[PDB]
Design an enzyme around this catalytic site. Structure first.
Site, PDB file in Angstrom:
ATOM      1  CB  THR A  53      -1.017  -0.027   1.413  1.00  0.00           C
ATOM      2  OG1 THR A  53      -1.651  -0.968   1.292  1.00  0.00           O
ATOM      3  CG2 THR A  53      -1.708   1.258   1.642  1.00  0.00           C
ATOM      4  CB  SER A  54       1.024   4.420  -1.808  1.00  0.00           C
ATOM      5  OG  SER A  54       2.093   3.668  -2.320  1.00  0.00           O
TER       6      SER A  54
END
Ligand SMILES: [Cl-]
Ligand SMILES: [Cl-]
Ligand SMILES: [Mg+2]
Ligand SMILES: [Mg+2]
Ligand SMILES: [Mg+2]
Ligand SMILES: [Mg+2]
Lengths: 204, 125, 222, 4, 196, 222, 195, 212, 233, 196, 195, 4, 4, 4
Positions: free
Chosen positions: J1-2
């Site tokens: 994730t970002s």
């Protein structure tokens, strides 16, 4: 250290024309040491037949358990339990022990006494039902049994033909497994007579 | 390693270094062996241009190779020690692996083989 | 940690008749749950009327076959073009395998051809070179499914003469090539049904005194 | 135990 | 470590922090991670201090011997000698090296050699633990054919950020300028670069 | 296993292959991986066979009781929530990987549930060992605004990719179509592209072949 | 292997060594002689790792016999024991060390004294009035500490040994199938045939 | 495996089974576990199938070279010691062998040596070797006499392998029988347990544990 | 005993009626970091062979050097070096396969999966695979990594057996390859959008296309996906 | 994730990529990592998908019950309920959560909750595997009291970079705008953000 | 513990059980009776983990004696064996299972038949003509397969047992210090005093 | 050991 | 298991 | 490999 192959043994079941057959070997050992030549793995509750392979203590325990459960079933329901129903009861009971299971490979065979249909089923140790038209296999020589059955079997065999086929599948599978054999029993089951035959086989 | 082929053939088909080794044997003190019906005797001359010798400690000319076999020789004395040691080692090794002492023929064949090896190996006479 | 072995699946089968022998194998090649190829042969004509398969880890199987083929080449060069008898091939292959006893070829090896009296011969090897002549052998992934079928159908095991009270065995007898190819084809379709690493195709090499013939059959592709 |  | 090398109009600039770590202890706060292997071929060192020093010493030796026999080596040649060492001894080495040099034909060149000993020729390169934090920044701000002053600023701002976020980077920012004009050493102290 | 779910115009369709494996062995050639949670909410399950059956029946049971208690038709999001919270509680040890789909008063829905208890929403989904083969097909052919017949074709095509290319998947294709305003139609063995070929020989034995030691009539009566 | 003892009395060294050879749950043999004659007045008993024991003993025997032939002379027990120790001391740092423990019993003819040496597989040498290897020592050392006297006769020595074997047959977990006893004195090496 | 060999009044009996296993998988029921080294020498195999087969046929080549070089048949002691010195060189490498070297020479008389891959070498009158050795021992020991007739000795050896074949899961197939005398070895046939068990049960009245 | 550091993902390929197509993206990953973007993983050898490589990039560069040295060595004392004694794809493959298996046998592998694509001098299509274990195989379609899982099922829809090859044109096959590359960009977390593609045709020879991009992507439906189950806005 | 959340003039914006990973396989390329726990209190989820969903569901339930009894909860209160769950179950949870909400008193607020269950109130926050690559960029480009359009651009450019370098990030960029005007969902596709 | 055997002949069940109790390298005792009388016509021998064996045996004995008092009746050997099996079958899935193997020999007075049950620590029950636990079976089963006949007298049974003990004393690695033999028949349980 |  |  |  693998509980499913300490004692050894096998069970096979087949359908025919208006009949079923279920067979097992008689060996009970402790690894390499053969201990008993009379250890049968097939039991019945009324007209429903149950074969159990795997750890012998669990085989014995489960037989005692299903006798218990079917006896109470009969008293309350006022009829003998049918194979389709017994199959479900086996499944429930094994899955109830999901994270501490009985190390067994049960096999159910019989004829539904209302519909006359032949019925067989097999289970994994945690209750998964495998229903089949043709054959179910179980035990330490299951690979061999799968091979024998898949080639020898054909649909709609007459009881005396089915007897030869299931016997040859069992015998020749047992002879390629060090932990199975030492005798064998075959049940031929028709709508209301059941013949039990002991096979002559190599004792090594 | 020093490699030179010292034992080689001459135009007449002789190996001069082997033949000259025989000359060294010829110059050596005499040795004789006679076998009876039930014994073997080994006799050896000792050249008598030597007094003040100490016979207690001076290397005797007959050597036990094993407790049932003896070897005597004529020729270069220092050379003979090398063959006797090798023969003695082989005698023990034969007992170790065959669980039987050497036959006299076997031990002879071994010593002979060592001698032959030194006639077609580089760097040795 | 680097693991120098892999498992390419498939299965092989050798049957020997009176004046012929067959060596069959499926043509599927796999790693894990993927199919690499649906047709990658693993039974080979090695010359001198010898067929050979080395089933298990394909890279080892190919290396071994290559080495044996080469061994046949030099046998000719060194011994005045003499024919390499099947018994001599077998022994030579034992040394090829056992030479790697401490870093084995992960293969089950079978060779087939004709013995020196013109009779059909099958030899099988464990991965480090134990060997034995037989009428009959399955090897590889589905060996355990097929072998007991062969004991029953080729050597007539557990089969008695009807009405002799289980006292007189079914008598042994050689099979025709037509019968043998039937047992091979049924063996492989059965194996394909119940083993995930077996399928796609079946290639049979038949060996008689007139040479090596091939037959190919489609197998289920799932 | 059988998988799917 | 935080290290980088950047090509520009007149050549190439190498930059690095000055922190050597021995745990969470700073064993050396004024380290020189920029290293000469030839007059105008230099490298930035990251990873093991011992490995990278041993490597650079060998490379310097090879190029000195190269020079004696065949004249000035190309930057590509120098990078090849680093690779050979890093690749062939990949099991025993922890060395992330950037090679940078100035030819008169080829102008500025940068080759980066990560852990496995692969070689990658690039307009600019960043490496070391602190480099992770400035991929975003550097990709957004780098252009080709910058001036000397622009390139010094790019490196100063980039390493400033790497040092800010990476605990394994710090001290002074060192730079080495490589042009036709020669070789110039620059240094920038915390009080300048920190508050950028 | 291979299983998929595909949304369309006026509902949702799910499909599954029919192979069960116990290691490399095919345990069951025709098991049903499509489960009815309620009449118009169906579930496709991959992973531990007993777990997918047991978890599907348990939640199906509680959904029925809930539907009776509330006098409402069950919603997919209730099955979703009950399944996910149950699976999460068991920290992954209940190995059920499910594609849940159905129609309810809110509309038509498609979800996946992984064994640790995370859920996903999409127009097309695939799970199981064959999920990459299937997903390759779905990513290639899926579009917005599929008709019912396009969706069925797409779904069974995705399952077929699994059957042919994944060793963990084989045999048949099961389908279930849940359209808004209509009964769910469960299409057991919708496709059967892996019919065993006719065997070469009948292995039916001469009667009396098997040696018997004893007989006896078994008493099944009272 | 397992049980090897030795007692040195006034005029001899007595070695007692168990006869059993066991592998797994089977006693393969009950008449094994765990000893080699190194020279006419030197005897060596041995116990340890299977295979290693005999290979080592025979190798020493071969070396000592070679020396005897070369010099026409018998090496003293002290000299033989030192040779043996060095061989084991080398071995312990080899790629695969000899796992063998030995007792060397000899009659030194120059001194007219019997001598008993105990050497373990590490090359640890000690001269003793009485010795044992393995678990045997845990019963016999204390027993011998009590009953042993320096000036005993060969007959007194054998009775003392009967005590040791009796105790071991009472308290040891294993059936070692009795002992073969051998006496080393001024007249060489002989074997007692009924023990 | 089960293998045995015992000395008696009339020479040496050698009897072995024919099963090979890989785990619980029965790999073969037709292994020849006796190797005929020369007309007066036999070797038995137990342990690793390849290890035994390879090194015991290698042993035969070494015995052949002895008699070419020495103009005399090799002693049982020397033949057994070649094998034991060979395996001792490989100690720790993981060779797995339990073998008996059985034969007659004029200098030795009938002789048996047990040789295994730990490097153990033992002369003796009776040995049983393999996973079924204990079962064979039980029968063999409790009926063994030095004075058994050749007829009785052959049967006892055969019966002892049968006992082990029955109880030991990793022994079976068939019994191979040999008799070794001053005139060399004589083969006394291959005996399938398939038929031998039932024949012995009937004729001897033993094996009552088994459903008849 | 190795572990791959800078790596290249899938290499995909197939036979068509007149030749072979092979493709591979231009990425060199460093674990989850997409570190290098101008990496060519298809290496042409002569004008009749392309070698596509996945796995460790340092080992790929080593293999490049071996191939470029092989060309040099083949020209030595060889007046037919650009004719009858030019390097064939089967020669180049067997050489690589030999090396791969020797390196695995020395417990020090080249950490790669390799596909050798080309056309033999008699016009036959060559497509064969070899990896770090020295395992080799041929098929009408071949792929490495995720490609094996996602490209093969798509490419086999076009060429499912030997007989399907004559029926497959270069336009059809390039379409399948290019579509397969898009799928891999959707689904492989270590793929890039940029890639190279090479066709080796028995008539037109070698066409090597650089700087291709995945296009015509479907992302629009993403807007309709809200929450993970019950959430609405 | 970002993932990230940014306060600005009129409130706060949350942003995230849409990639779910199951090994190196992308299990979901259109995931919604921005999750509602109340009308104008949302969170960005990173770490375990199962853990973060289970957590967010419980928090939503607590705040629904809070609302029924005591009216609208503050953003601080929502962050406290996340913390309590993350902190007390720190051994069994892999959840990195950013909480963002809009009060009318407090305007925009951002609380970040990393792995151990600590709480940190910030002007903006970044998290997830891809965040490492944009610490440099974000620190250099963030200012307080940006406009809506500036803040959308900041988030778009930042996550663009995180997605570019992080293999565990990708797909679309989702954003959720939180002001007095209500709640706005934004989405940006690869063809737009990639070539920024 | 270690050696426990049982043979059922025509009219009785004979149990033989080793007397040694060994801990470490010491035989602590050579007259240990590894048996408990459960009822006047039922006997149980046991072997296994130290402590567990006696604790288990006495616990079963207490339960069977309680039943006898409660019902003024003797439970059949089959019933006792089933009770014992269930106890072990429960135990095997406890926090700490009983590691005890048993032989139950009894004379059923309703049937006038002797009965021998072999039960291992997992709760694996089998009725047998002859039985053994541990390594003992590896010698005796084959021996008994040979020499045993179903209709043997008690005296024939004891001779058959002498054969088993002789073989075990020849081939077993350990000194188990002989056996205590007990006969269960229609007149109850008695002990043979010279074996 | 010192790192950079 | 799914990560984000 | 098999054993015997
Ligand atoms: Cl430094
Ligand atoms: Cl999620
Ligand atoms: Mg069997
Ligand atoms: Mg298949
Ligand atoms: Mg057996
Ligand atoms: Mg990305």
């Amino acid at each position: 250290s693998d509980p499913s192959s300490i004692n050894g043994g096998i069970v096979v079941a087949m359908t025919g024309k208006d009949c079923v057959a279920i067979a097992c070997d008689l060996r009970l050992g402790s690894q390499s040491l053969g201990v008993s030549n009379k250890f049968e793995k097939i039991f019945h509750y009324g007209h429903v037949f149950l074969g159990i392979t795997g750890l012998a203590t669990d085989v014995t325990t489960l037989n005692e358990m299903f006798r218990y459960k079917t006896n109470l079933y009969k008293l309350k329901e006022e009829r003998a339990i049918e194979p389709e129903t017994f199959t479900q009861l086996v499944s429930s009971s094994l899955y109830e022990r999901r994270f501490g299971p009985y190390f067994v490979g049960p096999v159910v065979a019989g004829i539904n006494s209302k519909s006359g249909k032949p019925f067989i089923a097999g289970f994994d140790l945690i209750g998964c039902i495998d229903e089949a038209k043709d054959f179910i296999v179980s035990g330490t020589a299951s690979d061999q049994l799968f091979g024998m059955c898949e080639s020898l079997y054909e649909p709609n065999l007459e009881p005396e033909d089915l007897f030869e086929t299931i016997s040859q599948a069992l015998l020749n599978a047992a002879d390629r497994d060090a932990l199975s054999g030492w005798g064998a029993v075959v049940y031929i089951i028709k709508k209301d007579e059941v013949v039990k035959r002991y096979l002559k086989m190599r004792q090594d | 390693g020093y490699d030179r082929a010292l034992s080689i053939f001459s135009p007449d088909g002789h190996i001069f270094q082997v033949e000259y080794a025989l000359e060294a044997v010829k110059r050596g003190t005499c040795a004789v062996g006679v076998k009876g019906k039930n014994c073997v005797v080994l006799g050896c001359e000792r050249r008598s241009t030597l007094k003040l010798q100490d016979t207690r400690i001076t290397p005797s000319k007959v050597s036990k190779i094993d407790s049932h076999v003896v070897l005597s020789f004529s020729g270069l004395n220092a050379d003979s020690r090398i063959l006797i040691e090798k023969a003695r080692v082989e005698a023990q090794s034969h007992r170790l692996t065959l669980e039987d002492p050497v036959t006299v023929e076997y031990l002879t064949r071994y010593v002979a083989g060592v001698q032959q090896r030194y006639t077609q190996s580089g760097g040795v006479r | 940690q680097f693991n120098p072995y892999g498992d390419n699946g498939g299965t092989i089968l050798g049957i020997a008749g009176e004046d012929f022998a067959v060596l069959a194998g499926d043509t599927r090649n796999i790693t894990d749950y993927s199919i690499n190829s649906r047709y990658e042969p693993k039974v080979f004509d090695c010359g001198d009327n010898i067929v050979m398969s080395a089933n298990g880890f394909a890279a080892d199987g190919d290396a071994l076959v290559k080495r044996f083929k080469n061994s046949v080449k030099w046998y000719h060069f060194d011994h005045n073009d003499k024919k390499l008898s099947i018994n001599s091939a077998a022994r030579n292959i034992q040394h090829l395998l056992y030479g790697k006893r401490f870093f084995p070829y992960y293969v089950h090896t079978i060779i087939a051809g004709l013995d020196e009296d013109g009779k059909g011969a099958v030899y099988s090897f464990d991965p480090v070179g134990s060997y034995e002549r037989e009428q009959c052998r399955a090897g590889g992934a589905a060996a355990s499914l097929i072998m007991p079928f062969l004991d029953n159908q080729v050597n007539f095991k557990n089969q008695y003469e009807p009405g002799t009270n289980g006292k007189v065995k079914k008598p042994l007898k050689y099979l025709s090539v037509e019968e043998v190819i039937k047992l091979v084809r049924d063996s492989f379709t059965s194996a394909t049904e119940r083993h995930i690493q077996v399928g796609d195709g079946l290639e049979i090499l038949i060996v008689t005194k007139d040479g090596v013939r091939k037959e190919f059959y489609e197998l289920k592709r799932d | 135990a059988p998988l799917x | 470590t935080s290290i980088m090398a950047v090509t520009f109009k007149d050549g190439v600039i190498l930059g690095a922090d000055s922190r050597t770590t021995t745990g969470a202890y700073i064993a050396n706060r004024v380290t020189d991670k920029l290293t000469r292997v030839h007059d105008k071929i230099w490298c930035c060192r990251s990873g093991s201090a011992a490995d990278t020093q041993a490597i650079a010493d060998i490379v310097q030796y090879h190029l000195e011997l190269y020079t004696s026999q065949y004249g000035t080596p190309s930057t590509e040649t120098a990078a090849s000698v680093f690779k050979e060492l890093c690749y062939e001894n990949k099991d025993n080495l922890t060395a992330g090296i950037i090679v940078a040099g100035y030819d008169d034909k080829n102008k500025g060149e940068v080759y980066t050699i990560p852990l496995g000993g692969s070689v990658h020729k690039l307009p600019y390169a960043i490496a070391g633990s602190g480099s992770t934090f400035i991929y975003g920044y550097c990709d957004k701000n780098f252009r080709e054919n910058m001036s000397k002053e622009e390139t010094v600023d790019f490196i100063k701002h980039s390493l400033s950020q790497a040092i800010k976020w990476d605990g394994s980077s710090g001290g002074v920012i060192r730079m080495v300028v490589l042009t036709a004009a020669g070789v110039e050493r620059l240094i920038f102290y915390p009080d300048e670069y920190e508050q950028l | 296993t291979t299983i998929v779910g595909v949304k369309f115009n006026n509902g949702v369709v799910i499909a599954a292959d029919t192979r069960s494996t116990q290691g490399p062995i095919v345990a069951d050639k025709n098991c049903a991986k499509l489960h009815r949670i309620s009449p118009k909410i169906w579930c496709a399950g991959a992973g531990t066979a007993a777990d997918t059956e047991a978890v599907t029946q348990l939640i199906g049971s509680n959904i029925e009781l809930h539907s009776l208690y509330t006098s409402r038709e069950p919603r997919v999001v209730s099955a979703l929530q009950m399944l996910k919270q149950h699976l999460f509680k068991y920290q992954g040890h209940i190995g059920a990987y499910l594609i849940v789909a159905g129609v309810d008063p809110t509309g038509s829905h498609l979800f996946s549930i992984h064994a640790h208890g995370s859920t996903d929403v999409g127009y097309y989904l695939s799970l199981g060992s064959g999920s990459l083969a299937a997903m390759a097909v779905l990513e290639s052919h899926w579009k917005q605004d599929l008709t019912k017949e396009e969706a069925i074709k797409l779904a069974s095509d995705a399952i077929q990719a699994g059957i042919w290319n994944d060793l963990g998947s084989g045999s048949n294709v099961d389908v279930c179509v849940m359209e808004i305003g209509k009964d769910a139609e469960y299409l057991r063995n919708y496709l059967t592209p892996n019919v065993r070929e006719e065997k070469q020989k009948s292995y039916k034995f001469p009667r009396g072949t098997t040696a018997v030691l004893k007989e006896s009539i078994v008493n099944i009566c009272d | 292997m397992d049980i090897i003892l030795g007692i040195r009395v006034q005029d001899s060294v007595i070695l007692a060594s168990s006869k059993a050879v066991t592998r797994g749950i089977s006693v393969l043999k009950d008449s094994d002689d765990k000893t080699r004659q190194l020279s006419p007045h030197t005897l060596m008993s041995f116990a340890g790792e299977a295979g290693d024991t005999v290979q080592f003993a025979e190798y020493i025997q071969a070396n000592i016999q070679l020396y005897s032939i070369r010099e026409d002379y018998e090496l003293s027990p002290q000299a033989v024991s030192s040779f043996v120790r060095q061989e084991l001391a080398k071995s312990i740092r080899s790629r695969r060390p000899y796992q063998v423990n030995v007792l060397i019993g000899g009659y030194d003819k120059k001194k007219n004294k019997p001598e008993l040496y105990q050497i373990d597989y590490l090359g640890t040498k000690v001269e003793l009035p009485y010795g044992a290897h393995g678990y045997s020592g845990f019963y016999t050392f204390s027993l011998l500490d009590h009953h042993y006297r320096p000036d005993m006769t060969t007959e007194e020595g054998l009775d003392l040994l009967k005590l040791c074997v009796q105790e071991l047959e009472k308290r040891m977990p294993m059936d070692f199938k009795g002992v073969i006893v051998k006496i080393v004195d001024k007249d060489g090496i002989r074997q007692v045939d009924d023990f | 495996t089960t293998t045995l060999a015992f000395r008696f009044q009339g020479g040496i009996i050698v009897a072995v089974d024919s099963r090979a296993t890989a785990g619980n998988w029965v790999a073969s029921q037709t292994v020849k576990k006796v190797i005929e080294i020369n007309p007066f020498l036999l070797g038995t195999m137990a342990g690793g199938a390849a290890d035994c087969q390879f090194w015991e046929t290698w042993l035969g080549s070494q015995c052949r070279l002895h008699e070419l070089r020495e103009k005399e048949r090799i002693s049982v002691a020397a033949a057994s010691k070649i094998l034991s010195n060979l395996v001792y060189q490989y100690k720790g490498a993981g060779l797995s062998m339990g073998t008996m070297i059985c034969g007659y020479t004029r200098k030795e008389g009938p002789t048996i040596y047990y040789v295994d891959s730990d490097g153990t070498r033992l002369k003796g009158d009776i040995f049983c070797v393999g996973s079924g050795q204990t079962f064979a021992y039980g029968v063999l020991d409790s009926n063994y006499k030095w004075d058994l007739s050749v007829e009785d000795a052959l049967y006892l050896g055969k019966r002892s392998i049968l006992a082990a074949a029955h109880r030991d899961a990793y022994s079976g197939g068939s019994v191979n029988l040999y008799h070794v005398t001053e005139d060399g070895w004589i083969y006394h046939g291959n005996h399938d347990v398939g038929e031998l068990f039932w024949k012995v049960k009937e004729e001897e009245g033993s094996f009552n544990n088994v459903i008849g | 005993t190795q572990q791959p550091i800078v790596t290249g993902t899938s290499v995909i390929s197939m036979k068509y009626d007149n030749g072979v197509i092979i493709a591979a993206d231009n990425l060199g990953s460093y674990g989850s970091l997409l570190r290098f973007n101008g990496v060519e993983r298809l290496i042409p050898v002569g004008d009749n062979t392309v070698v596509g490589i996945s796995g460790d990039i340092s080992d790929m560069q080593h293999i490049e050097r071996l191939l470029k040295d092989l060309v040099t060595e083949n020209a030595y004392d060889n007046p037919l070096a650009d004719a009858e004694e030019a390097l064939e794809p089967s020669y180049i493959f067997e050489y690589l396969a030999t090396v791969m298996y020797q390196r695995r046998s020395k417990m020090n592998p080249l950490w790669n999966a390799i596909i050798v694509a080309g056309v033999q001098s008699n016009g036959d299509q060559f497509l064969r695979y070899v990896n770090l274990l020295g395992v080799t195989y041929s098929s009408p379609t071949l792929a490495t990594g995720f490609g094996a899982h996602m490209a093969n099922p798509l490419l086999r829809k076009v060429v499912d057996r030997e007989s399907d090859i004559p029926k497959t044109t270069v336009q059809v096959a390039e379409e399948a390859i290019v579509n397969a590359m898009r799928v891999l960009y959707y689904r492989d977390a270590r793929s890039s959008r940029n890639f190279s593609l090479a066709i080796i045709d028995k008539n037109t020879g070698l066409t090597f296309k650089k700087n291709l991009q995945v296009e015509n992507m479907k992302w629009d439906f993403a807007k309709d996906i809200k929450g993970y189950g019950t959430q609405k806005i």
